Amino acid sequence: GLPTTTLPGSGQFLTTDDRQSPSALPSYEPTPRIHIPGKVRNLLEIIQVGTLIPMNNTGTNDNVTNYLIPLHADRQNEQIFGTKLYIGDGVFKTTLLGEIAQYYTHWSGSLRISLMYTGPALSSAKIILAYTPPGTRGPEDKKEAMLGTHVVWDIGLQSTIVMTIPWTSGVQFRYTDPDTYTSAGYLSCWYLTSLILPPQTSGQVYLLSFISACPDFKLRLMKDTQTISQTDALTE
Amino acid sequence: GLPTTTLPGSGQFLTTDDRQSPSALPSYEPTPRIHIPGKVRNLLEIIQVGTLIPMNNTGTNDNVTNYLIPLHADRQNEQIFGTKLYIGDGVFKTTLLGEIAQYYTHWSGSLRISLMYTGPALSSAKIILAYTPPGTRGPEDKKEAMLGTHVVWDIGLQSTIVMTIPWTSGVQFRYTDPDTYTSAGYLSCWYLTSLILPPQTSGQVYLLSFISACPDFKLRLMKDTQTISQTDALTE
Amino acid sequence: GPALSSAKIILAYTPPGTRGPEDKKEAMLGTHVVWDIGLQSTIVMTIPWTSGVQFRYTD
Amino acid sequence: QTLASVSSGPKHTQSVPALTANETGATLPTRPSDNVETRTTYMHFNGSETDVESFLGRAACVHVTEIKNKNAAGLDNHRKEGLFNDWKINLSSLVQLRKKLELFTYVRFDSEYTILATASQPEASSYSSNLTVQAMYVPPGAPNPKEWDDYTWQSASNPSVFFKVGETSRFSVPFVGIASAYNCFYDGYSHDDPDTPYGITVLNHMGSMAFRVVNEHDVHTTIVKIRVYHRAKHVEAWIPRAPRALPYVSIGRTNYPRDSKTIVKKRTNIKTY
Amino acid sequence: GYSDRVQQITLGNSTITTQEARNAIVCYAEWPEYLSDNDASDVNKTSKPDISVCRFYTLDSKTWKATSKGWCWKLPDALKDMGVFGQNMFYHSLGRTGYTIHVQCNATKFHSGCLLVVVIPEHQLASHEGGTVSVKYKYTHPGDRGIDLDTVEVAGGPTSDAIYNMDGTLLGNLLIFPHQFINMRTNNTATIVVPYINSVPIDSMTRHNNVSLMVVPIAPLNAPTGSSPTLPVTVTIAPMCTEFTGIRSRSIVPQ
Amino acid sequence: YTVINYYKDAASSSSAGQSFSMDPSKFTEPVKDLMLKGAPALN
Amino acid sequence: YTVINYYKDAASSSSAGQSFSMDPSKFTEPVKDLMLKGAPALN
Amino acid sequence: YTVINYYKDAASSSSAGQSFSMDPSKFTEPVKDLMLKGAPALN
Ligand SMILES: [Ca+2]
């Protein structure tokens, strides 16, 4: 009859503890495991996969056109798109990365943005993708933009351009929830030259943009999302 | 199903116990530590640093003049200052030593008092600093004073004089809170000769006094201070 | 000056390419020496060869 | 045995340890044997109780809040009615601990939270209800409770504890700073704007905690008061500062009352004992 | 033959000399050094302009009157218009640096007065109003001018209380911070070497001041009879081991 | 005395021991040139 | 830290450790012919 | 029987054992010159 002393917290139910418990079905034999392709071990495995960004946020209702970035021929010096780098909000909120990032509180790492050209093969263009670190306003023109991290894209056989957004930060982790101190800067696109279409061709050409995380990435402090809720319990 | 017996005290919450508890954030990875100069390991480390004593306690409102000890020229045999040695009270209460001493119940050790001269370079003086152990009244004159622990200071290039107050006590620990049985004696200052100013000079000259603990020092029985309180909880 | 006096002076060299400094602020942006007057009676400042071409004309 | 003092005799040297120069900014470790004839004595002491682990290693109350358990029928603001409450975890609302923490500039540690919930029934009730409280850890970005029984209390990913009123809950929390340490002070802003706040940084964010009674309602109302205690474990502290002298007036601000002018006790004569 | 009193500091194309020093303080016993890989987070390459920014810049002079309260400078703010340093400071998203602060005040063997020269890491100022009112950005970003403590207080600015260190703490305890005194009878100058102190490896140089240099008269200035009742106070500062990153377009700040 | 950790996370453990690496010097003698007690503070 | 199982059934035990065998490739590069970063995606 | 201390502080431990070093002499025969039972108490 071993003397003990019970401590504060005795009897509490902390949803996050990890202990042993008796099995309600003692002696039970689970079905044997069979091989199944596509095993997921860590969420960091799947955010490395790029998914489309609904950059054409313009409109009222969701529609396949949200993923299409319009490009215009014979335009020079002009801006193609702009956006803040709030992965837990704005255009990135619905993406797979932003979707999973919202289950965590902190994030850190480099980002990958690819732009895939879908215009005719007989067309040409030179675009400029830029990342403006925190500390200023979004660039107002290509001149301001090119002063930061950028990539000049030459449209050709190689259909996609990939630009990495290197972890540019003082503090080692930023919040996924949009917070001023932990902002990541801006992202913008402009014509370095201009889109040139061949004869017998007209209208708009579109760009498809993808977002994914680099191996650099980290996400901590698991929490509940704002991307799902309910007013009543569901039934069959 | 191991037989036990629970003891008195079971379920109590003693703010001072030290035990293990489950982590509410299991699997979480804290930010890496970076090097930061000025690491503090023990409070005894910082009380060895001398800070100014507001010895010119005279007045109604706090003012930079509280730290200035007035000195007068052509005065002989006179007294410059006097004070009891209650480190948790009086002039020492606001100092860094007295400030930290008040988080503890007992104290023991030798004290360091430095007096820094700020008068002109072309002036001269000889002062006498004294420590009167417990058992009598504060000295009433230099003659009475010099019969105890004292230092004769010759003002010169070496701007400061340092006098240590050796642990002079029967009982090994004294209370920080002013208690008669555990009093530390008195401290006083007088002119051994007198302050002599050069031509084209006049007015008062001041002395800056510092207090710190020697490596001798000890402080035990941690408790709450009287140097901070509140009537309501604060809000943003 | 007397031994019982004090001063702190600033000597400056402004390389070619601009106008002579108009104030101490402009001046201190170039080669300079802050002089503390004391026992050591003299201050020595060297004007380092600051030039593109290897020789200049005396005229 | 470490020596507190060594045997030391008379002197007549050119080596004068009693004289120095505080202008330098240093405090030389003089000992009584530099100015007095001494005897050998032993420290008989290690200095355990003054280690910062010790100093900040005991639980201190960091917040007191209240919630209730009534009939939420017809009530349009559960928060105002007191059916659930929040707390934006901060350690500077209660002053006892705040003055201790602030003795340093940057501070890094693990937290040991102990939550006490006591109940009271101030008006006519047949019995005392046995209630269960839920404490939810709501990280910034997670959805905020709006009603006392929202989908939010499902708390599928947010840590939560269920405990009884009269009992206590205890759990530890890792250092959750986005930087390498917590800022006791921060002489900066969130961005260079003319109107944004000063001092307060997400660099001190520890979270927000939500509270509620899980039980339905009885015939009477029950008032539950929650007291949160914090204990720091595995402590690290850098850059010591001057103690606080003036009263505190606001959370995360060094602001002090302007009519507070006499912190130092006054005499009449600098010569009195 | 050499002395603790006569010294020379050569940093870039600037050399300072003093014949009446009182040693010098190397904050927390640590000398400045660049950011290491172990401590680094940001994947970008850091720019090290060297001798073009790591040189001595002299701030606009102050005038020590017998009624003076003190002065406060905030870094890196006070050097934001100083040659190539200020430029770099506004083109990069992040920077890091340490300094060599040299405070000057010469006088006469007939004068008496004492200045406390202290460096305070994270000097979060208290507001004129108190309450929940914050000290407006522009008031903590005075640039070269700094904060003159005997200037009338304005709404949204700091308090002008030297006795309370402008933060609710007492003046005498300011000695726990790396400091040095300028005691005329002894001193002529004060020199303090400051390493980079922060909770993050690198930071924004515009939205956050890492330290504030404070020069506070403790013992009033007392000049000889017939002498000029004032003395000027000069502050010379040199950034050391400066690094910049996150280069882009010019940072846009309020004013 | 004995102690074994019952939890996986390091945060769960009790208080860390006494540092025993005190060094008041970084605060009491952060001078560039070494000063020796007994010798002229300033020469 | 230490753990001994108090129950007979494997289900009764606490959480399994960290997999440490992450491999995003099955999802990020499930291509038949190997593509090398830096070389023409399509030749 | 067995006992292991569960706490860090020495005060926390249970009762100390039996002294087994009794010596009534300091109280019963504190005489300077030794007196032997059986011999003249005073000679
Ligand atoms: Ca009843």
Q: Compare all CA atoms of chain G with the CA of F4 and give the residue at the minimum distance.
A: G1
Spatial distance between the Cα atoms of B35 and E239, rounded to a whole number of angstroms? 20
Q: Across the interface, which of B3, B7, B31 has its CB nearest the CB of A173?
A: B31
Cis amide leading into F24 (omega within 30): no
Both tokens assigned to B194: 């007198």
- Burial (CB < 10 A; 0-12, 13-18, 19+), residue A14, is buried
Please, what CATH class does the domain formed by G1-43 belong to? Answer: few secondary structures
Spatial distance between the Cα atoms of D24 and B145, rounded to a whole number of angstroms? 31
> Facing residues of B152 across strands?
B128
Spatial distance between the Cα atoms of D233 and D109, rounded to a whole number of angstroms? 6
Using DSSP bridges, classify how beta strands D208-213 and D84-85 pair: parallel, antiparallel or unpaired. Answer: antiparallel
Smallest CA–CA separation between B61 and chain F, in Å?
Answer: 31
> Facing residues of D134 across strands?
D162, D212
Both tokens assigned to D103: 């003795």
What number of CA atoms fall less than 13 Å from residue B143's CA on the CB side? 0
Topology classification of domain E1-255: Jelly Rolls (2.60.120)
> Facing residues of C32 across strands?
C12, E14
With beta carbons under 8 A apart, name residues in chain G contacting F11.
none
Smallest CA–CA separation between B104 and chain D, in Å?
Answer: 9
| Interchain contact, D181 vs B36, CB within 8 Å | yes
Interface partners of B (3+ CB pairs, < 8 Å)? A, D, E, F
Q: Find the angle CA(B38)-CA(B39)-CA(B42) to the nearest 5 degrees.
A: 125
> DSSP code of B31?
P
Kindly list the residues of chain C whose beta carbon comes within 8 Å of any beta carbon in chain E.
4-8, 10, 24-25, 28-40, 43, 45, 48
What is the number of CB-based contacts under 8 A between chain C and chain E? 59
What number of CA atoms fall less than 13 Å from residue E162's CA on the CB side? 25
Q: Which residues are CB-contacts of C24 (< 8 A; sequence separation ≥ 6)? A: C10, E58
Q: Compare all CA atoms of chain A with the CA of D133 and give the residue at the minimum distance.
A: A12
Residue at token pair 């402008």: E166
CB neighbour burial string for A123-146, b if at least 16 within 10 angstroms, e if fewer: bebebbbbbbbbbbebbeebebbb
Nearest to C40 by CA among E5, D172, B38: E5
Assess whether chains G and F touch, using the rule of 3 or more C-beta pairs within 8 angstroms. Answer: yes
Assess whether chains D and B touch, using the rule of 3 or more C-beta pairs within 8 angstroms. Answer: yes
Architecture of B1-236 per CATH?
A: Sandwich (2.60)
Nearest to A117 by CA among A50, A47, A69, A185: A69
With beta carbons under 8 A apart, name residues in chain E contacting A149.
248
Spatial distance between the Cα atoms of E62 and E161, rounded to a whole number of angstroms? 18
Assess whether chains G and E touch, using the rule of 3 or more C-beta pairs within 8 angstroms. Answer: no
Rg (CA), chain H: 21
Q: Provide the residue count of chain C.
A: 59
- Say how far residue B62 (Cα) sits from the centre of its chain: 18
3-class DSSP state of D95: helix
With beta carbons under 8 A apart, name residues in chain D contacting F11.
110, 172-175, 233-234
| Dihedral of alpha carbons B218, B223, B226, B230, sign | positive
With beta carbons under 8 A apart, name residues in chain H contacting F1.
4-8
Experimental method: X-ray
Q: Which of residues 124-183 of E touch F (CB under 8 A)?
A: 176, 178
| Interchain contact, F13 vs D53, CB within 8 Å | no
Nearest to A8 by CA among B193, B202, D112, H4: D112
Both tokens assigned to D82: 């007191």
Spatial distance between the Cα atoms of D264 and D267, rounded to a whole number of angstroms? 10
Spatial distance between the Cα atoms of A18 and A34, rounded to a whole number of angstroms? 28
> DSSP code of A196?
B
Q: Where are the domains of chain A?
A: 1-236
> Facing residues of B225 across strands?
none
Spatial distance between the Cα atoms of C34 and E8, rounded to a whole number of angstroms? 10
Instruction: Give the type of residue at E192.
Output: I
Both tokens assigned to D256: 């002090």
Interface partners of G (3+ CB pairs, < 8 Å)? A, F
| Interchain contact, A41 vs G19, CB within 8 Å | yes
Using DSSP bridges, classify how beta strands B160-165 and B111-117 pair: parallel, antiparallel or unpaired. Answer: antiparallel
> DSSP code of C15?
-
> Facing residues of B58 across strands?
D267
Spatial distance between the Cα atoms of E140 and E77, rounded to a whole number of angstroms? 9
- Judge contact between B88 and B176, C-beta under 8 A: yes
| Dihedral of alpha carbons A98, A99, A105, A110, sign | negative
CA-to-CA dists, residue B166 to B99, B129, B169, B172, D148, angstroms = 21, 14, 9, 13, 65
Q: Provide the residue count of chain D.
A: 273
Q: Compare all CA atoms of chain G with the CA of F7 and give the residue at the minimum distance.
A: G1
Both tokens assigned to D24: 């330098």
Q: Compare all CA atoms of chain F with the CA of G15 and give the residue at the minimum distance.
A: F8
Spatial distance between the Cα atoms of A176 and A101, rounded to a whole number of angstroms? 7
Helix or strand (DSSP H, E) at D182: strand D182-183
Both tokens assigned to A177: 């929830």
With beta carbons under 8 A apart, name residues in chain F contacting E173.
none
3-class DSSP state of D167: strand
Spatial distance between the Cα atoms of B175 and B183, rounded to a whole number of angstroms? 8
CA-to-CA dists, residue E76 to E79, E107, E196, E203, angstroms = 6, 30, 11, 11
- Judge contact between B44 and B217, C-beta under 8 A: yes
3-class DSSP state of A5: coil
Instruction: Give the type of residue at A156.
Output: G
Q: Which of residues 81-120 of D touch B (CB under 8 A)?
A: 88, 92-96, 99-100, 103-106, 108, 112-114, 116
H/E/C letters for each residue in G9-24? CHHHCCCCCCCCCCCC
Can you give the residue range of the structural domain that contains D174?
1-273
- Burial (CB < 10 A; 0-12, 13-18, 19+), residue A122, is exposed
Tell me, what CATH number does D50's domain have?
Answer: 2.60.120.20
With beta carbons under 8 A apart, name residues in chain D contacting F31.
24-26
CA-to-CA dists, residue A60 to A55, A56, A63, E247, angstroms = 14, 11, 9, 38
Both tokens assigned to E176: 């726990």
| Interchain contact, B218 vs D36, CB within 8 Å | no
Instruction: Give the type of residue at A174.
Output: R
CA-to-CA dists, residue H35 to A4, B108, E41, E207, angstroms = 55, 47, 86, 91
Max CA pair span of chain D: 91
Q: Where are the domains of chain E?
A: 1-255
- Judge contact between D139 and A223, C-beta under 8 A: yes
> Facing residues of D165 across strands?
D167
Spatial distance between the Cα atoms of E167 and C14, rounded to a whole number of angstroms? 43
Assess E122–D contact: CB distance below 8 Å, yes or no: yes
- Say how far residue B167 (Cα) sits from the centre of its chain: 14
Spatial distance between the Cα atoms of E200 and B34, rounded to a whole number of angstroms? 7
Spatial distance between the Cα atoms of F22 and E135, rounded to a whole number of angstroms? 37
Using DSSP bridges, classify how beta strands E25-26 and E189-194 pair: parallel, antiparallel or unpaired. Answer: parallel
Spatial distance between the Cα atoms of A131 and A134, rounded to a whole number of angstroms? 10
> DSSP code of D229?
E
With beta carbons under 8 A apart, name residues in chain E contacting C30.
13
Nearest to B166 by CA among A5, D38, C40: D38
- Judge contact between B104 and B222, C-beta under 8 A: yes
| Dihedral of alpha carbons B10, B14, B16, B20, sign | positive
- Judge contact between E191 and E25, C-beta under 8 A: yes
Spatial distance between the Cα atoms of D176 and D186, rounded to a whole number of angstroms? 18
Assess H3–F contact: CB distance below 8 Å, yes or no: no
Using DSSP bridges, classify how beta strands E179-183 and E92-104 pair: parallel, antiparallel or unpaired. Answer: unpaired
With beta carbons under 8 A apart, name residues in chain C contacting E18.
36
- Judge contact between C9 and C35, C-beta under 8 A: yes
- Judge contact between A74 and A194, C-beta under 8 A: yes
Assess E87–C contact: CB distance below 8 Å, yes or no: no
Rounded to the nearest angstrom, the distance between the alpha carbon of D69 and the centre of ligand 1 is 19
Spatial distance between the Cα atoms of A132 and A139, rounded to a whole number of angstroms? 8
H/E/C letters for each residue in A95-158? CHHHHHHCCEEEEECCEEEEEEECCCCCCECEEEEEEECCCCCCCCCHHHHCCCEEEEEECCCC
Spatial distance between the Cα atoms of A13 and A11, rounded to a whole number of angstroms? 7
| Interchain contact, C5 vs E20, CB within 8 Å | no
Q: Which of residues 119-178 of B touch D (CB under 8 A)?
A: 137-138, 149, 151, 158-167
Spatial distance between the Cα atoms of A160 and G41, rounded to a whole number of angstroms? 10
- Judge contact between D23 and D50, C-beta under 8 A: no
3-class DSSP state of F29: coil
Using DSSP bridges, classify how beta strands B4-6 and A2-4 pair: parallel, antiparallel or unpaired. Answer: parallel
Nearest to A220 by CA among A156, A172, A152: A172
| Interchain contact, F43 vs E29, CB within 8 Å | no
Q: Where are the domains of chain G?
A: 1-43
> Facing residues of E92 across strands?
E247
Assess whether chains G and H touch, using the rule of 3 or more C-beta pairs within 8 angstroms. Answer: no
Number of domains in chain D: 1
Instruction: Give the type of residue at C14.
Output: T
Spatial distance between the Cα atoms of A137 and D5, rounded to a whole number of angstroms? 65
Rounded to the nearest angstrom, the distance between the alpha carbon of D128 and the centre of ligand 1 is 8
Instruction: Give the type of residue at D112.
Output: E
Both tokens assigned to F28: 């009491």
Residue at token pair 């370095």: A192
Using DSSP bridges, classify how beta strands E231-247 and E62-64 pair: parallel, antiparallel or unpaired. Answer: antiparallel
Spatial distance between the Cα atoms of A123 and A107, rounded to a whole number of angstroms? 40
Helix or strand (DSSP H, E) at A82: strand A79-84
Q: Which residues are CB-contacts of E221 (< 8 A; sequence separation ≥ 6)? A: E64, E65, E66, E68, E111, E112, E113, E229, E230, E231
Both tokens assigned to E244: 């910049």
Both tokens assigned to A227: 């991307």
| Interchain contact, D242 vs E210, CB within 8 Å | no
Both tokens assigned to F26: 């970084």
- Judge contact between A169 and A216, C-beta under 8 A: no
Both tokens assigned to B133: 């152990």
| Dihedral of alpha carbons B220, B222, B228, B231, sign | negative
Residue at token pair 């003036």: D246
Assess G18–F contact: CB distance below 8 Å, yes or no: no
Assess D49–B contact: CB distance below 8 Å, yes or no: yes
- Judge contact between D63 and D93, C-beta under 8 A: yes
- Judge contact between D237 and B90, C-beta under 8 A: no
> DSSP code of D260?
-
- Judge contact between E111 and E225, C-beta under 8 A: no
Helix or strand (DSSP H, E) at D53: helix D52-55
Q: Which of residues 16-45 of E touch B (CB under 8 A)?
A: 27-30, 36, 39
Spatial distance between the Cα atoms of D206 and D137, rounded to a whole number of angstroms? 10
CA-to-CA dists, residue E47 to A185, B77, E33, E51, E243, angstroms = 20, 66, 14, 13, 5
Nearest to A109 by CA among A195, A234, A219, A216: A216
> DSSP code of D97?
H
Dihedral (Cα; D259, D263, D264, D266), 10-degree rounding: 50
- Judge contact between E72 and E213, C-beta under 8 A: yes
Resolution, given in Å to one decimal, reads 3.0
Both tokens assigned to A27: 């002696």
How many C-beta atoms surround the C-beta of residue E151 within 10 A?
10
Spatial distance between the Cα atoms of E117 and E237, rounded to a whole number of angstroms? 13
Q: Across the interface, which of A5, A17, A173 has its CB nearest the CB of B6?
A: A5
Spatial distance between the Cα atoms of D55 and B100, rounded to a whole number of angstroms? 11
DSSP chain E: ---SS-EEEEETTEEEEESS----EEGGG----PPPTTT--S-SPPB--GGGTSS-EEPPPEEE-TT---EEEEETGGGTTSHHHHHHHTTEEEEEEEEEEEEE----TT-EEEEEEEEEET--PPBSS-TT----HHHH--GGG-EETTSPP-TTSB---TTTTTTTB-GGGGGGSSEEEEETTT-SEEEEEE----SSSSB-SSSB-SEEEEEEEEEEEEPPTTS-S-EEEEEEEEEEEEEEEEE-SPP----
| Interchain contact, A44 vs G22, CB within 8 Å | yes
- Judge contact between E146 and E139, C-beta under 8 A: no
| Interchain contact, E178 vs D25, CB within 8 Å | yes
What phi and psi, each to the nearest 5 degrees, are found at residue B179?
Answer: -130, 135
Instruction: Give the type of residue at G3.
Output: V
Assess E24–F contact: CB distance below 8 Å, yes or no: yes
What phi and psi, each to the nearest 5 degrees, are found at residue B51?
Answer: -130, 155
